[PDB]
Amino acid sequence: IAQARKLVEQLKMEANIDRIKVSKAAADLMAYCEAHAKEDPLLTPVPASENPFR
Amino acid sequence: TEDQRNEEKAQREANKKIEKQLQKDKQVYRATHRLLLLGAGESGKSTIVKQMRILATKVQDIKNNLKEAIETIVAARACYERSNEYQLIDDQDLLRCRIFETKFQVDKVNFHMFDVGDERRKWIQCFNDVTAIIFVVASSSYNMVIREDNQTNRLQEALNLFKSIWNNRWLRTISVILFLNKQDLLAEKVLAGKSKIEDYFPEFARYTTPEDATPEPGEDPRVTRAKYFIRDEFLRISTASGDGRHYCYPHFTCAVDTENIRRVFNDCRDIIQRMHLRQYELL
Amino acid sequence: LDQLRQEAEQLKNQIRDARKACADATLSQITNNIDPVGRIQMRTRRTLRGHLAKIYAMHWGTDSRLLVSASQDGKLIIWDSYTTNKVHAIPLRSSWVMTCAYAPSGNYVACGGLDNICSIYNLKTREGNVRVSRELAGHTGYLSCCRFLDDNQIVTSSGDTTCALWDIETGQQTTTFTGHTGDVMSLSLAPDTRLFVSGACDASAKLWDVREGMCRQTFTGHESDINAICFFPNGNAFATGSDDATCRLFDLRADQELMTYSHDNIICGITSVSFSKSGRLLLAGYDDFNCNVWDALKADRAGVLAGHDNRVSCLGVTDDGMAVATGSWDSFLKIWN
Amino acid sequence: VWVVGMGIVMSLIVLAIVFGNVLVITAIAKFERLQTVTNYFITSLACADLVMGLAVVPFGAAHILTKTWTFGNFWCEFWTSIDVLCVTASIETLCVIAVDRYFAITSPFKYQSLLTKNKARVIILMVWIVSGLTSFLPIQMHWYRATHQEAINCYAEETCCDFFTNQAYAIASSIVSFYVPLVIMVFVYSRVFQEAKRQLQKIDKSEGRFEHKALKTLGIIMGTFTLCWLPFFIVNIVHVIQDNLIRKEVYILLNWIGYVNSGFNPLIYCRSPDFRIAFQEL
Numbered sequence: 001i002a003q004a005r006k007l008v009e010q011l012k013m014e015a016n017i018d019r020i021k022v023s024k025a026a027a028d029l030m031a032y033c034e035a036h037a038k039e040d041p042l043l044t045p046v047p048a049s050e051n052p053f054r
Numbered sequence: 055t056e057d058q059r060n061e062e063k064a065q066r067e068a069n070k071k072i073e074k075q076l077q078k079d080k081q082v083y084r085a086t087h088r089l090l091l092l093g094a095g096e097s098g099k100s101t102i103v104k105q106m107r108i109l110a111t112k113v114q115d116i117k118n119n120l121k122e123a124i125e126t127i128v129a130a131r132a133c134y135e136r137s138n139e140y141q142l143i144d145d146q147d148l149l150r151c152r153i154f155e156t157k158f159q160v161d162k163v164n165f166h167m168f169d170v171g172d173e174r175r176k177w178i179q180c181f182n183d184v185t186a187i188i189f190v191v192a193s194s195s196y197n198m199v200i201r202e203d204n205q206t207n208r209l210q211e212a213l214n215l216f217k218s219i220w221n222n223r224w225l226r227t228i229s230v231i232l233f234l235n236k237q238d239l240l241a242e243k244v245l246a247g248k249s250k251i252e253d254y255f256p257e258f259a260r261y262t263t264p265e266d267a268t269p270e271p272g273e274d275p276r277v278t279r280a281k282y283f284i285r286d287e288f289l290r291i292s293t294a295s296g297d298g299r300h301y302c303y304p305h306f307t308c309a310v311d312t313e314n315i316r317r318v319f320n321d322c323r324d325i326i327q328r329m330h331l332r333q334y335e336l337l
Numbered sequence: 338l339d340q341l342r343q344e345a346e347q348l349k350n351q352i353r354d355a356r357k358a359c360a361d362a363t364l365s366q367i368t369n370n371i372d373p374v375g376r377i378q379m380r381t382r383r384t385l386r387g388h389l390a391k392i393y394a395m396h397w398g399t400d401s402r403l404l405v406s407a408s409q410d411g412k413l414i415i416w417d418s419y420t421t422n423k424v425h426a427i428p429l430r431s432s433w434v435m436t437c438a439y440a441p442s443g444n445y446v447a448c449g450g451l452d453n454i455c456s457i458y459n460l461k462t463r464e465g466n467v468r469v470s471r472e473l474a475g476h477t478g479y480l481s482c483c484r485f486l487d488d489n490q491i492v493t494s495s496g497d498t499t500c501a502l503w504d505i506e507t508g509q510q511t512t513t514f515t516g517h518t519g520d521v522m523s524l525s526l527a528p529d530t531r532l533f534v535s536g537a538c539d540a541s542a543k544l545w546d547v548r549e550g551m552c553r554q555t556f557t558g559h560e561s562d563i564n565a566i567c568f569f570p571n572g573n574a575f576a577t578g579s580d581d582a583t584c585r586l587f588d589l590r591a592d593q594e595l596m597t598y599s600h601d602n603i604i605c606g607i608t609s610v611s612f613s614k615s616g617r618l619l620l621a622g623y624d625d626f627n628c629n630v631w632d633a634l635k636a637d638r639a640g641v642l643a644g645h646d647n648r649v650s651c652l653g654v655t656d657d658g659m660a661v662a663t664g665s666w667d668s669f670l671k672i673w674n
Numbered sequence: 675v676w677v678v679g680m681g682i683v684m685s686l687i688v689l690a691i692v693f694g695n696v697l698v699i700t701a702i703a704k705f706e707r708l709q710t711v712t713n714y715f716i717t718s719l720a721c722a723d724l725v726m727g728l729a730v731v732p733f734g735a736a737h738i739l740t741k742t743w744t745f746g747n748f749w750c751e752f753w754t755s756i757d758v759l760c761v762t763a764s765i766e767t768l769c770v771i772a773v774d775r776y777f778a779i780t781s782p783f784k785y786q787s788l789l790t791k792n793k794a795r796v797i798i799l800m801v802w803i804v805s806g807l808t809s810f811l812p813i814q815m816h817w818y819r820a821t822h823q824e825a826i827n828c829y830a831e832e833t834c835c836d837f838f839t840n841q842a843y844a845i846a847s848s849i850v851s852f853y854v855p856l857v858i859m860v861f862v863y864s865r866v867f868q869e870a871k872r873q874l875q876k877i878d879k880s881e882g883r884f885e886h887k888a889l890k891t892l893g894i895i896m897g898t899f900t901l902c903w904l905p906f907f908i909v910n911i912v913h914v915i916q917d918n919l920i921r922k923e924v925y926i927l928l929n930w931i932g933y934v935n936s937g938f939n940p941l942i943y944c945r946s947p948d949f950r951i952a953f954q955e956l
């Protein structure tokens with residue numbers, strides 16, 4: 001029962017944490033994606049002049 | 055462009071020197087056959103490797119085993135009679151004592167044998183390009199139980215493993231070689247009236263000796279039927295599926311004696327021959 | 338011991354209530370306004386050949402020009418994507434290799450497999466000879482993945498349900514991580530190199546702390562063994578590979594499942610996952626002979642990469658997001674753009 | 675006017691051979707999985723058959739239909755040399771394939787070391803060279819021509835040419851083309867059948883619980899080639915023994931019958947599931 005005793009205390013630590021709403025995280029992710037979508041060569045094809053593999 | 059001309063030559067030398075070396079190594083890899091050892095615990099995997107390898111500290115280690123064996127007997131002549139009730143561990147002296155890769159050559163042919171190395175069995179997906187799989191069981195341990203759970207028959211435990219290996223998605227085109235070890239212990243146990251085989255396996259009562267048999271002249275009738283009963287159970291699972299891409303090669307062998315007169319070589323020859331002969335559209 | 342066991346069930350009930358109270362709406366409701374990406378088709382630019390057997394591992398370099406591949410043949414070959422030229426071929430003592438890495442400084446390469454020993458090699462050697470530098474041998478179980486934090490640190494994960502942080506200078510485990518009940522198969526560090534996750538075979542994912550050495554958040558609900566894991570560029574999310582042809586995206590702050598990517602016609606497994614530079618495309622391999630490109634914010638297929646003749650066992654994306662490289666079991670590397 | 679009806683079928687037959695050979699040749703280059711040491715001989719046979727169908731079938735059909743030749747005597751000699759070279763090439767490849775099969779089945783252990791890409795290339799180059807040598811060298815040296823009034827009359831004639839040969843060259847060509855490979859192929863396939871029967875018997879013994887296919891496969895493989903080629907070579911070797919025994923019409927008909935082996939070869943060969951899948955892909 002020694003192994004079970006140690007595992008019990010760990011679950012207590014995880015319970016007492018701060019949490020936020022899902023909507024805020026969704027908005028943050030959408031804002032990050034919108035901000036960084038410009039410099040993404042995979043999405044917007046690069047010109048053949050500036051294409052290292054072409 | 056001047057800079058590239060100096061640089062390109064170096065990448066050409068490296069690509070060249072390396073490409074020539076890798077081409078040579080292809081012949082070595084192609085002309086080599088690999089084998090895998092599998093089975094249940096306390097079966098004799100190391101003894102088979104010891105016999106094949108035959109083609110100090112060990113004495114002290116055997117002495118330590120003797121001391122452990124003596125202590126085990128003390129805790130348990132009359133104690134040895136009840137050795138079936140409790141778990142007990144069983145050139146000539148080397149085999150008696152209790153990833154390991156061994157490479158040997160027979161008839162100018164390169165062979166590679168690596169040991170197994172755990173009920174998840176996730177590493178099995180790696181050995182998808184092996185010539186054959188060697189599977190070893192103990193044919194004289196039906197009245198025994200695995201240590202972790204005392205509710206499971208040692209022997210039945212071995213089959214539950216063969217069916218899982220046989221009905222595996224990755225090992226769909228890999229043949230299996232069967233070694234039914236510990237034959238000498240079976241002969242002595244069956245002759246004794248005690249520990250009847252029919253007590254544990256009810257189907258043995260209605261079993262009959264097959265017409266197509268080849269008992270050694272010396273062996274008693276009772277023993278042969280018993281021996282053939284174990285093999286028949288194993289082959290029943292193998293013959294259920296396979297669709298011609300799977301083949302099992304049962305054998306009877308005793309780890310003490312070197313009955314292995316190049317039989318692994320002969321079996322691998324037949325397996326490769328069958329692979330070639332069925333590779334064509336029909337032959 | 339019944340009171341202690343019953344106390345554990347009491348904690349689980351409180352966690353579910355707190356998580357349920359923090360779900361205003363699903364992500365799909367919020368992201369319905371965006372326009373679809375469309376159809377994306379990429380053609381193979383370079384094909385890399387010269388391997389003798391199946392390939393398990395792959396990793397790009399800091400310069401996004403050099404990559405290293407590991408195969409069951411026992412050879413560790415370093416390529417050059419721009420000009421298709423081999424640079425080194427390091428022989429291995431063991432023929433079973435399951436992972437590889439590459440240093441950010443480009444001076445060290447790691448390896449591991451069924452030998453239960455993590456090996457490290459030196460590239461920029463004096464006298465120009467590659468040679469084993471250290472042999473980290475104190476461990477049990479077959480390794481699964483290895484990553485470099487710096488020139489003197491490395492993290493490893495194996496099949497003995499433990500993760501450890503090594504030290505090259507002393508060759509001893511500075512700290513060890515415990516708590517998993519199954520084989521650990523994948524891990525990925527954060528850009529800040531302060532937190533790292535690990536997906537085990539018990540259908541759970543955990544977020545560890547390098548300095549503290551204790552678990553912080555355990556995720557759940559996969560319903561099958563996790564076989565790969567990636568990490569979002571923004572640093573607040575990570576996606577998980579699946580036996581059940583399902584990719585799930587988790588959030589650290591919300592501590593909730595956001596979306597599940599699935600399709601009716603697929604019943605195969607998942608071997609590798611990765612993200613893009615902008616965190617919009619979720620590339621992933623499959624056991625049904627090709628790879629599919631998903632949409633992170635829409636769960637809609639936007640292209641098929643079917644240029645392979647065998648199963649896909651690795652995948653990687655360059656740091657600058659210029660090309661995608663995928664391996665296979667037929668000893669062929671392909672570069673897509 | 676039965677010529678119009680017969681001519682239509684000839685056009686379809688010629689086109690079928692080219693279409694079948696083209697698909698086989700293209701598959702090996704397009705897909706990397708099909709390439710192997712064995713497929714080199716198949717590719718060589720397909721190329722030879724395609725060359726034959728593209729070169730000698732149309733000119734021969736046009737000459738038969740129009741009953742006149744306008745290109746000239748040099749073109750007739752070149753066409754005859756090309757036809758004999760193409761015929762000599764196809765048969766030799768099949769014997770090589772049979773020898774390769776026998777090597778693979780009999781000694782699997784040494785098969786990998788005995789066969790190499792360089793060795794296969796050398797063997798196929800030697801086969802092509804020996805096929806070409808017996809065709810161009812005797813024909814162009816004009817030692818082909820025999821001594822007869824009909825022979826000199828045909829040689830002097832400009833608009834018509836016919837296949838008239840001396841006994842010695844006919845015997846040599848028949849021996850080097852047909853008779854020599856046939857005995858080797860028969861012995862190879864008999865040994866293969868014996869080994870397969872022994873293996874099947876051994877397999878039957880191991881499992882009490884729970885060779886039509888091999889016999890059928892060997893039968894079709896041997897019989898198609900034998901029935902296609904034996905009568906023509908028999909009548910060719912009988913022609914030089916006695917002139918009045920056989921006429922030219924039956925000779926031409928049997929020659930045309932023998933031409934069809936080029937079209938039959940791609941159907942019987944390369945019938946593996948991988949080949950069918952690759953063909954259906956494109």
Ligand SMILES: Nc1nc2c(ncn2[C@@H]2O[C@H](COP(=O)(O)OP(=O)(O)OP(=O)(O)O)[C@@H](O)[C@H]2O)c(=O)[nH]1
Nearest residue numbers: 094095096097098099100101149150151152236309
């Ligand atoms: N009497 C007898 N003993 C045998 C025979 N084969 C093996 N043994 C003994 O069985 C013991 C245990 O088998 P090992 O070879 O050590 O077992 P292993 O290879 O480690 O296989 P696992 O225990 O399954 O991992 C050995 O010490 C041998 O002395 C046999 O045919 N007869």
Ligand SMILES: CN[C@@H]1CCc2c(ccc(O)c2O)[C@H]1O
Nearest residue numbers: 754757758761837844847848851
């Ligand atoms: C014009 N047709 C020729 C005539 C005789 C002949 C052929 C082929 C192979 C030979 O060894 C021959 O002697 C035929 O293709």
